[PDB]
Amino acid sequence: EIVLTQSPATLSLSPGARATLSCRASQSVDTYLAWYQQRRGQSPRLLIYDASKRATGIPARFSGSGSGTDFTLTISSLEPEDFAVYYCQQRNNWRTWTFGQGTKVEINRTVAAPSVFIFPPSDEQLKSGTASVVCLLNNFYPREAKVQWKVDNALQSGNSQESVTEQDSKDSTYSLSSTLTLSKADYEKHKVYACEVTHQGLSSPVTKSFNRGE
């Protein structure tokens, strides 16, 4: 019956700066709204309840406000642990507890283009009948990046999987690995394997490729 929407889903802010997070309810919840912080690798903790009350022991930099449908969580100065995911929460009809989908607060920094590397399958893997081709995008910011795989200029869709690291503790960048999976038989039918990367730090997409056997 009641949906909580947190938008934007990602906030990019500087250490020590102010942050304001939004929760909007589809219909009024009066002031019965809570906020939780989920720090990296930790359990969620209650920060704010009844829209504006600070839970016991919670630092004074956390505040909240709102009544009805529009709520905010304010962090007066972002500390290192505050780069985290925040969820709002409500309870309707006595027996249903629901959450928003979360807002991630990430560290803002200057744009950095990825360095890109392509890796052929090893001969050892090919023995077993499968080929994994890996594309690495190293140390980039912001997080948005597009990898396109091509095999003899045929765009690949559906046969790759990607993973991304958490923001680096020293330089606040991301890295990404994309793995293209093909059968050995298919791998050996084609010559040019390419990973094309689009990113805001690149004036035009970068392609890294290899020719099988060369």
């Binding site: 809570a34 209650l46 507890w97 989908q101 190293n138």
Partner: protein, 217 residues
């Protein structure tokens, strides 16, 4: 101090059952309702079940009703979640929680990981991600493929190399086995003289591999 400690997590086959336990200390366990909230990998929080202070009222999420049972034993300061007919979509970290007024989750446990899968325990194959050897920065790595369950650990040069390492989150393949890569950037001028070894440990299968990664002939 208020404390909630969960136990009973693990790997379970689809259709089977698992019982989670959560023991409270540092507060009056019988005074308030208790709850389970779960988080699937990479996803948000989902409330699962609630039980009133004396066990007289139970509420469940629609996704879980009939299959899960919440119960409590106040004399042992314990709340339970009995999970039956487990489904892949029940894979998650399960948190127990307690409340002051019933509106909110005032205190949370540490989580119990539940993985629902028909996969058999299997250690990884470790393949090299060989440096191109073509700013003078090279990248190399290890592909840690086809293992179950999580987790695997990866170090480089037995911990002597930590700068520039990125060990990526595992992906779950349609086979039901996990795969992950670990990479490191290093100076390309070092590739002929420095040895780089990835150290892979998959404790569930007692599998340890040290793979030297070098430029391919």
């Amino acid at each position: 101090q208020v404390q909630l400690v969960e136990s009973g997590g693990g790997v379970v086959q689809p259709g089977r059952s698992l019982r989670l336990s959560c023991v409270g200390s540092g507060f009056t366990f019988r005074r308030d309702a208790k709850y389970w909230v779960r988080q699937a990998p990479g996803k948000g929080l989902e409330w699962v079940a609630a039980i009133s202070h004396d066990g007289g009222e139970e509420d469940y999420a629609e996704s879980v009703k009939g299959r899960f049972t919440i119960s409590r034993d106040n004399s042992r300061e314990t709340v339970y979640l009995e999970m039956n007919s487990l489904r892949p979509e029940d894979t998650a970290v399960y948190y127990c929680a307690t409340t002051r007024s019933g509106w909110y989750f005032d205190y949370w446990g540490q989580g119990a990981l539940v993985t629902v899968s028909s996969a058999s325990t299997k250690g990884p194959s470790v393949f090299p991600l060989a440096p191109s050897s073509k700013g003078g920065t090279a990248a190399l790595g290890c592909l840690v493929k086809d293992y179950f369950p999580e987790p695997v650990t990866v170090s480089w040069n037995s911990g002597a190399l930590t700068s520039g390492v990125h060990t990526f989150p595992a992906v779950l393949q349609s086979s039901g086995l996990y795969s992950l890569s670990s990479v490191v950037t290093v100076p390309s001028s070092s590739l002929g003289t420095q040895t780089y070894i990835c150290n892979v440990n998959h404790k569930p299968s007692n599998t340890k591999v040290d793979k030297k990664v070098e430029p391919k002939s």
